[PDB]
Symmetry: D2
Subunit: 494 residues, 4 copies
Amino acid sequence: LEQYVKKILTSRVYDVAVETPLQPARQLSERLGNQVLLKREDLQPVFSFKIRGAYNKVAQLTEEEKARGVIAASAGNHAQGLALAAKRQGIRAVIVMPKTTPEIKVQAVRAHGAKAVLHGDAFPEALAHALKLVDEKGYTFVHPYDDPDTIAGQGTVAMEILRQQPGRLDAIFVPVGGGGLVAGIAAYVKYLRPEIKVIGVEPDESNCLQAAMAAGERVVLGQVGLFADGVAVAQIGQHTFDICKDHVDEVITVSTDEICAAIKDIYDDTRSITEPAGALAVAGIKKYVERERAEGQTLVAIDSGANVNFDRLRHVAERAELGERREAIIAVTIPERAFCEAVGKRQITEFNYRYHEAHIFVGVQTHPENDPREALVAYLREKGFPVLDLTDNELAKLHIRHMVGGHAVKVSDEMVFRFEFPERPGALFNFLTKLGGRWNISMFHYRNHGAADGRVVAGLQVPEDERHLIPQTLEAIGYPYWDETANPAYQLFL
Amino acid sequence: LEQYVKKILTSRVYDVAVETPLQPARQLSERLGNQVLLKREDLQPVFSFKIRGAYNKVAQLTEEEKARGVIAASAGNHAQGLALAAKRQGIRAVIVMPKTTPEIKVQAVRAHGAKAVLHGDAFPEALAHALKLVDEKGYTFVHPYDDPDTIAGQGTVAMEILRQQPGRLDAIFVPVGGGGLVAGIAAYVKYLRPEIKVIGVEPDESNCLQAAMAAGERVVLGQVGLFADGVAVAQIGQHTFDICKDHVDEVITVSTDEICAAIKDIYDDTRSITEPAGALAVAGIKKYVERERAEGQTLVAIDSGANVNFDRLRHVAERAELGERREAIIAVTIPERPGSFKAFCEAVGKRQITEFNYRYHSGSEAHIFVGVQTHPENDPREALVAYLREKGFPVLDLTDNELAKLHIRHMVGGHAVKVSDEMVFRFEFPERPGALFNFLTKLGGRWNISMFHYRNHGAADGRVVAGLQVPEDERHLIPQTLEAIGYPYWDETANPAYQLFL
Amino acid sequence: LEQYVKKILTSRVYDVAVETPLQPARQLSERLGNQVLLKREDLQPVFSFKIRGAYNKVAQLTEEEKARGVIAASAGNHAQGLALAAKRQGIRAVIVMPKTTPEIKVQAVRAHGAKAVLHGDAFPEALAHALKLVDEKGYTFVHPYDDPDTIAGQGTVAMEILRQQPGRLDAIFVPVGGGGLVAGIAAYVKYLRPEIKVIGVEPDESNCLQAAMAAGERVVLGQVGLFADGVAVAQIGQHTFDICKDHVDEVITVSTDEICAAIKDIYDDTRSITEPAGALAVAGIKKYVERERAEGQTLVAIDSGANVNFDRLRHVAERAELGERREAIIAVTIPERPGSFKAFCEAVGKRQITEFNYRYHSGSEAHIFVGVQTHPENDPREALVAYLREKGFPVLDLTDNELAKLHIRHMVGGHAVKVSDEMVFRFEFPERPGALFNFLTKLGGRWNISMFHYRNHGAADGRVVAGLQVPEDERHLIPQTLEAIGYPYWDETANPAYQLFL
Amino acid sequence: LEQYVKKILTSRVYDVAVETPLQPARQLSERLGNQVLLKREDLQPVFSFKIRGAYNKVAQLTEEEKARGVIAASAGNHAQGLALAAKRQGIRAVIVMPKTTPEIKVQAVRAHGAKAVLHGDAFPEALAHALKLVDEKGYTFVHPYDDPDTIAGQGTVAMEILRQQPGRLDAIFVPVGGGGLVAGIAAYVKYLRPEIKVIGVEPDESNCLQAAMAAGERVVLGQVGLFADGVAVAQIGQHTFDICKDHVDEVITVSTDEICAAIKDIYDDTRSITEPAGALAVAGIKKYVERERAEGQTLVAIDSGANVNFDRLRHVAERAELGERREAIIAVTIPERAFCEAVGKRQITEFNYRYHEAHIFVGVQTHPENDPREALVAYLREKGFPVLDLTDNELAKLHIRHMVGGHAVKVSDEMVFRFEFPERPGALFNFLTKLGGRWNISMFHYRNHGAADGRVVAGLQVPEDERHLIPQTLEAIGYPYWDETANPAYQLFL
């Protein structure tokens, strides 16, 4: 503990790692009734804290070891941290990573002038190749977490926090992979200000520290979740567990959806993007505040990293959206005797139908206080519309949203037209009103989840002898449109 | 020009605005063969440059004008800029915004101690209410762009850039709403280093400066696109146009999709998210580099803001996917046989499948809507299609079929042709290349699949629904068979949403 | 004006020059009834502003001009400015300076890797050697002031001041050598905030700008004073005068003594030592405040440099003492009696005695040259003189007698009138008010004091020499008597310096 | 030790104290053959380090204690440190100081809004009055050094140094008054990097720590020197000695003249002025380098303060000048048969004479290598001038310099004239040549110790019947002059 603090105070991290802000999360603080502070380790040059530990380790090596070079086995944040650390020291770095590793992560490593050697289908094979090269070539292995110099480097995070928040500080929430970050933080905190709680946060699918603490030994998880890839570690480090077992107060676990909501919360207060591992701490805070009914506390989260691919953000946003209970999903039957009048100028997210008595799959923005869906449903029913409320129906939201269509047995004369219109309050209903009922609508699809342009496809029953009227009629509507009647995608599936 | 530069040099912006980095965009620079630099105005305390101009305007007001307070009409960046500016000066601020305005933006304004007045269904009504309150209450209106003190404040952006990049600098690309930002930048640049090009960038749907410059007067656009909401301005400012008409070299317009791709490019190099208006400049750079076949130039983009709702990233990502055309979409015909759907899934191999959708139509044949990630070099679409065809699968390539990607993706399903033995089951499994095929392997072939929906767009947990033809006298086997798979599952046969639509 | 401002805004000074504080001078402000602010150019790495202009000039040179290197002729601030500038640019620098130049300044130049060439007995010969080497070797000469790029570099001082003090600022006071500093400041100030007065300050002995402005041409002064060595320039620069003639409001001249008092004032408020040139501005402020009876103004002084040899502080302190007139000088007549000298020392009391000197002239009467610290409020000179007279001492007040302070202070002594029994003893004791009288008490009255010298100008250890009339037959008593005093002492009776002069 | 380090790491000093540069002393390093670094505590807002300890102490007080106010007994750096500390906390401060205290120091305290109560002829009486007010009024006494919170505050100096100089560091040299500064530094250094020597430096006249360490107890010095007023402390603190006795490696003592030379050295490298206490460390370094023949070491000095009155600098410069051996002092006899020709254009500092065979007291700039005085003396003697070399003659330099004059028994017709001329190589000799020998010079005084104007007084033997010629003759010389023949200062003494 003393030994670790001395190493923290004499670390070399500031050759390349930077001091990061400890920022208030204003809206999250208001919601929770506690002062929430975000430690912005995402603002390190490699977009995670790992530059601290990797650099501190590399910098402590002998002139001889540095001459031979360093090696690691990693496809991720450690790889980048070590690569930059090596470049800063002017030494050669070899990073071994699985052949399956995505090309964008490979290039990120090579961008710092490290050699990325592609070997193995998974981490264990990569690791074994690296360890072989240690003996063959005399490279010094640099472990992602299980190394005293690494731990001490990560501990500089706590050194900063305690300097930045010298007053009240109830608890620090730390994501836990192999335990380097939390061990370094716990060492420093429990030495200087032991009244502060050090709380680990792990995914349900990767709770190696929580399980180890419960079992009192270093259990090996049967597998780890892929979502929180920053903390995909099956077994707690040895050097890290030796600190954690006594100096971490507890580990809270959180789910994928909790992580997704935390990513959005952080974005809403800071405009910064965290990777799943980087949002664990805020997710832990939210779960802790509810479990303890905490009020008036000062709670710190380590925003540990931001290395999440753009394509993952779509899914993150989809999952965080579910929490918000804005989107009502309702199935509306239209008698053969408006509807849009009752729904008004509300934001439509889904408006899907296919002739089989007429049923429409409707998604519509609502608000729990300002525009509750229950009143709208009752309103529509009282107007004589059969309505099913599918807002809590998982199949509806996950699947049926994408399944209204199919072939219709007895639609002849179906022609298919795609249209585009500028999005505006009432635009869809205005489109349908201008489209009119000169021909029967036998199919409709329309989705709007933050879309710029309104995009709709409609099937119309147009008798052969009225088809000459199509150009004129549709042009009169005033929107760009395309005749998709001969589109093979339409023919095969619809 | 001189007048504006003197105002820029004596501005008060640094009471609350900060100096922002001018950052290399490394991967974009390598791709383009030009040094691209990003001016990070997203790192202002209100996540856009507008704190500069709003503060400088407020700070130049007389004690008299300050007395009752300041007012604006804005649902976005200007609202926040002005609210913080007013808090810093210790003055009252009222911000008028439409009733429809999202709660998150309302609260952001109130958080700085400003009064948020909710009035109107659209901006023009909010604006009129604000302007009325000017006369009623004696508040001083603070314009988002059309004010010399605002222009001078925004011009501090150029003052920083020229200090930060004293060497080669070919062109600065600036998003243009009402022209405050670009007018301030143009004033300073054309004064000090006129060899630098000042290039405005506007959306195709909101090109009020480009149209004004072409017409030589301040035309009013018949409407503005709402995608790039930060620059949704129908008419160029008067004070701004007086500068721009002579000192902006040109305006390049870009599409929504180009903006979306620029948002991703910026993210890939910096991890920052720009709002659409904030990505215009990089979109302009990409269009300019191609138009000029530029090489070895130094090109600066103003990343003007980051105030985009998180949920809008879904659409942004969908559009940036289109182009690159990594996602193949194919229609595959198979015979209606117990194991054909599975066998075809096997042929696709260990790839990121994005869509795998089917619904029984006749006994003659079945069609599967398939989405698959591909890579032009590493795993080309064309070779995969040929590979599948050579295995005896009819395949239509629908990758460039807009209807397929926009609509049919969400329309494979519909009602069972006949009454039959369909039971419906939802399942979840860890998402991973090969997980779908592994699921179908574990599910086995006791029962015909009559319906399937599966989408995977960056998902963590794989989700499928399957319709299975389970004869009444085999239904006793269902719990044990499905539990043996080892995944969470739900019997949705009686789900009313299934009954009504499918 | 515009041309110069553009050069200032694009200068390269911040590669090595730093932003300096603009600091309140609290005690000076209270005394003067105006807010005085000190621009701390002494805090540059070379202890003067000249790093700005020298670096900006060097940085604007062509690769060709840089190739063989740069040269200057300077024994002071410019030498150091240029040497550091050249080191920063990675170029060769040669500095020519007179053979007589002090070793400390030579080494300072060499420390930055510049060649110091020692040539000439005075500056003009050094200058000519440098200019010759320009042609011989192809070095580019770097002028201390008369160069547009130098002027623009110095002008960054004004750019900082106007940013640091955006509110009220009545006047900026600038030392003037050849006019680089003031021209750069005037250019920027008269462009941006022309309501601010730009006031040059020169020594009476070196008023080349003041004379040039009065004559409307670049007069050559017949000689320059060497006290304020930083501004020892006979003729205003050409490029500098082109700006100054229209854009400097006036030049105030100050004396050496005024400069010395300003050096102390600055020290008292900041603990910094300015060289004479560096204190001109504050001296100008004091003269201006009195001339205008200014009240409530904000007045800025450029503390331009700190490169004064430590030993010159002796003279500076001596001159700053004169005025204030705290040191009383009096001539006191006493009878020639065993105990009169001591009794008179007693009457002076526990005060800081600065001088207490006497040498026997006749048996009729003795005269003592006395210096004593006084205070106008706390311990007034006039009351002390009256106090001593009222005790029956003839006293002449020589406080305003220049001969007394400059010369007689060092001339009380000379040869014994007759041969006698004079022995001479030097003593040391801890300096403290009353220590002298305590020494004379301990020395006692066995022997007549026939000579005494004692000076105390901030001394730590008190030092006295006394001549004592010790009859041959009492000399055995000397060791024990003097040891009993308890202080170090030395018998100097056989000291050849004593024999020859006294 | 651990306890002190925890207090150092959690101190409150940075509310008002600043981080100070650790600056290379380039020319001193070259001379000594060691890397010398100066810790610039003179750049604190009160021009000494004492703001650190005083603030840290005050800030730790209870709300109640702060409400009542703080008191100290000090006329010096502590007074200013405490006054500013109190102002920063918005609390009342009373500083008791002797009635004899100089008015400029009293006003410095009042400038920070502290009440300065004038009581006692010396410190002990001031202290007793303060301690009485503690009981009467409930003020919290703030000790200049002997307080754990004060020690911890001063220790932040070491925290900075070890961060600023993470590589080689052989020894840190610290001025010692009551031992707060050195105790705090020693605590931190011996904890983190015990290989670094911690060396105290005291004046010969105030060596309370050195004596205490030698005696193994807290000896009381019989008196303290006044010159190094910052460290005028007769007895080492209790809390400070408890650290120092084990954790300070040694104390070096230095003299007044050594201190004066160090003040100049620091000025020559930094242009900063240290007070005597503030220059002790550099003086210690110089003495250590010679004693150890140190080479290639890294040696740090605490430049602890700059609160020395302007008037003291004259004396400091006079004493530091003596070290330089530039000024030759010679007594030259002028036969009744040049001289100035032999001396050439050298810088004259003294040129004094009064008729009694003719002897001149001459001060002249020389250089040990470039222009040695021995060669000049031999040169002058070989030209037939009796010369005494008085350069090493203390009476000559301290006293006779100011004593050449007196009455002359048989000078009648003496008239006295003061002149001024611009200083220039050869100016004095040029003046004397132009003054000529129309009348005999019977007296001369001239000193030049960095003077701007040449100032001389001359006695001339002018017969009554030639006095009409005086205005014309002297005006022809071309310098301003004044007839001082009737000046009573001349009459009485000369």
